Structure 1
Amino acid sequence: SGFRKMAFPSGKVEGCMVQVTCGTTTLNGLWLDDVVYCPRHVICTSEDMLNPNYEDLLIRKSNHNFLVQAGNVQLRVIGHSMQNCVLKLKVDTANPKTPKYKFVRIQPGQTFSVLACYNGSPSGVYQCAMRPNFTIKGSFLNGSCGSVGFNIDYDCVSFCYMHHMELPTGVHAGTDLEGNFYGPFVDRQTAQAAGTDTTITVNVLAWLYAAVINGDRWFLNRFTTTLNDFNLVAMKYNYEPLTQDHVDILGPLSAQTGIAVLDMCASLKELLQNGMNGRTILGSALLEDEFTPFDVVRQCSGVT
């Protein structure tokens, strides 16, 4: 028993990290097969960042200007291309540590593990959620760009995020592995609105089920609610509206605990209206929304 903000084991991803330098800028790259993927802003100088013309900046670069190093050994770049906000550097050697992988675009509210890197070397791993407004609340310093987010299913790594930027508000923005930003963000040093965020209701409910499974049950009450009534409360508290698709996803947890989804909604409604009264749930004094229903089942069942 016990419930932790658990990340996927990072070994398969560590084997893909490389350093990419172009001119004066160094960041991380992801080496899969014979391609190294990295943020395109590796080609900018500080003077370019206010509004870079990436097409023009890349035209001044040749393959030999992209210094790619995997540990202590240099990789030979035999092609480069820009796809959206990422550069793809073709190298002459396939990464011998390439795991089985996919590139996926995750939905807002889904979670993933980030392997934070600097200079092509790993610093640490942590789990986070893609916020409903497509930002991430990570731990990323300058030099962390090119660090990636991922999930694993058995032996397959699904890469979903590449880090590009910290907005002036201190939250993070990045792309899928095809270089498309999540959200309205652009890779330039400007203030950019992230827009209204909300709490991931289906994840808070999953985490309440995790709390029941792990012995924390004080918040269970004698009440029930309906999707309509619960959604009036979710509206008031800036929570995402709950749908039958979310209730369906919570089915396995409802079956395991014997607690109907709408009964757990009524527990959540009371917690929103009354607060925790100085009490905690799974070591937290707030309602946690960074565990999906799949995360809860995976952690509570010991999937490897």
Structure 2
Amino acid sequence: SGFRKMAFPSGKVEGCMVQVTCGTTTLNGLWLDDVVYCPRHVICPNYEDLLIRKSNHNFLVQAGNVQLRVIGHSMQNCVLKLKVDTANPKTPKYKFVRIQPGQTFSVLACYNGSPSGVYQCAMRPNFTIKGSFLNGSCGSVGFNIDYDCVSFCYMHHMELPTGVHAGTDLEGNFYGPFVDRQTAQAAGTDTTITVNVLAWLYAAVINGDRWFLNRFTTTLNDFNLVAMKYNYEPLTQDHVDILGPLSAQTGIAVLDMCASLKELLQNGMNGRTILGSALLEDEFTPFDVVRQCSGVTF
């Protein structure tokens, strides 16, 4: 029993964290095989012009107490790729994946190439992450683990004026309408990840919390009218299908759980909590709930 916000074990990623220094800037890099990936703002803009002026010896790469030698440099979108002479012996089985809003991933927050913390979080529908990052955290990565394969999905680049965070996939493409330049940027109005709230309501039922359940069911169209009104993301037939296994395990049809969510949005919690929370949690996907309420290992 119990339900916690749980991150993937970070060991496979810790063995890839390196420190990257160029000029006065120091941030984190991801050392995979003979390449170190890091935010291109470490050279800081005309990034092509700035990069052509740099030579390999300008980039100081440090893996533990060992300095790696840069033998090449190239740029792919907002990520800088520093070719090094040594392949990382600790390189796990990995792939670069771009995630969708609502999907969750674990973040290994680093400072000076040294991992300091791991937390679980979701790509908000406005493409920001509500992370916890200080100066020096740039280059920290977001990932998921599937069997023994690490899926790198995020690299930290910047903090928006509201304290929320913006970054790219490992191919340097930003999530959201953000740029890696000093300019006025604002995160759009955020919405709640509806499929994730429903998954978390199923986790609460699996843990014996049933007070919010009701005899009612709704149509998907009637629920989506309510979802729009309360700044909740639309629920698609895909989401309903993905929630299928949880619906089967708990005996509560997805549209039956939607009528519970609808009542919760219109009436509130009334001094009650769900899984120790007075708010509806939207940072557990349907897969996260199945994984935690079944015990899948890595």
TM bucket, shorter chain: over 0.9
Matches of 2:214 and 2:191 in 1, distance apart? 25
| Counterpart mapping for 1:261-272 below 5 A | 261-272=254-265
Offset, 1:260: 0.4
Matches of 2:241 and 2:200 in 1, distance apart? 16
Matches of 1:65 and 1:116 in 2, distance apart? 25
Matches of 2:266 and 2:248 in 1, distance apart? 26
- Is contact 1:198–1:240 with CA below 8 Å preserved after alignment? yes
- Is contact 1:167–1:191 with CA below 8 Å preserved after alignment? no
Matches of 1:109 and 1:277 in 2, distance apart? 27
Offset, 1:2: 0.6
- Is contact 1:99–1:156 with CA below 8 Å preserved after alignment? yes
Matches of 1:185 and 1:135 in 2, distance apart? 9
Q: How many aligned residue pairs are there? A: 297
Matches of 2:117 and 2:19 in 1, distance apart? 16
Residue 80 of structure 1 is matched in structure 2 by: 73
CA RMSD of aligned residues (A): 0.6
Q: Deviations over 1:90-149 (max 9, x none)?
A: 001100000000000000110000000000001100000000010000000110000000
Runs of 5+ in structure 2 lacking a partner? none
- Is contact 1:146–1:162 with CA below 8 Å preserved after alignment? yes
Matches of 2:90 and 2:216 in 1, distance apart? 53
Matches of 1:168 and 1:191 in 2, distance apart? 9
Matches of 2:48 and 2:161 in 1, distance apart? 25
- Is contact 1:163–1:174 with CA below 8 Å preserved after alignment? yes
Matches of 2:19 and 2:124 in 1, distance apart? 28
User: Secondary structure at 2:101's aligned position in 1?
Assistant: coil
- Is contact 2:243–2:254 with CA below 8 Å preserved after alignment? yes
Matches of 1:211 and 1:245 in 2, distance apart? 22
Offset, 1:169: 1.7
Offset, 1:194: 2.2
Offset, 1:234: 0.3
- Is contact 1:27–1:145 with CA below 8 Å preserved after alignment? yes
Offset, 1:59: 1.6
What is the percentage of aligned positions where both structures have the same residue? 100
TM-score, structure 2 as length reference:
0.99
Matches of 2:177 and 2:288 in 1, distance apart? 27
TM-score, structure 1 as length reference:
0.97
Q: Deviations over 1:181-207 (max 9, x none)?
A: 000100012221322221000000000
- Is contact 1:22–1:42 with CA below 8 Å preserved after alignment? yes
User: Secondary structure at 1:231's aligned position in 2?
Assistant: helix
Q: Deviations over 1:129-188 (max 9, x none)?
A: 000010000000110000000000110000000000001121100000000000010001
Residue 196 of structure 1 is matched in structure 2 by: 189
Q: Deviations over 1:9-68 (max 9, x none)?
A: 000000000000000000000000000000001111xxxxxxx22112112110110000
Matches of 1:115 and 1:10 in 2, distance apart? 7
Q: Deviations over 1:223-278 (max 9, x none)?
A: 11110111111011000111111000000000110100000000000000000011
User: Secondary structure at 2:119's aligned position in 1?
Assistant: strand
- Is contact 1:20–1:68 with CA below 8 Å preserved after alignment? yes
- Is contact 1:164–1:175 with CA below 8 Å preserved after alignment? yes
Residue 258 of structure 1 is matched in structure 2 by: 251
Runs of 5+ in structure 1 lacking a partner? 45-51
Matches of 2:107 and 2:140 in 1, distance apart? 7
Matches of 1:176 and 1:283 in 2, distance apart? 33
Matches of 2:238 and 2:78 in 1, distance apart? 33
- Is contact 1:199–1:289 with CA below 8 Å preserved after alignment? yes
Matches of 1:253 and 1:218 in 2, distance apart? 18
Matches of 1:84 and 1:133 in 2, distance apart? 21
Matches of 2:184 and 2:262 in 1, distance apart? 36
Residue 136 of structure 1 is matched in structure 2 by: 129
- Is contact 2:161–2:186 with CA below 8 Å preserved after alignment? no
User: Secondary structure at 2:293's aligned position in 1?
Assistant: helix
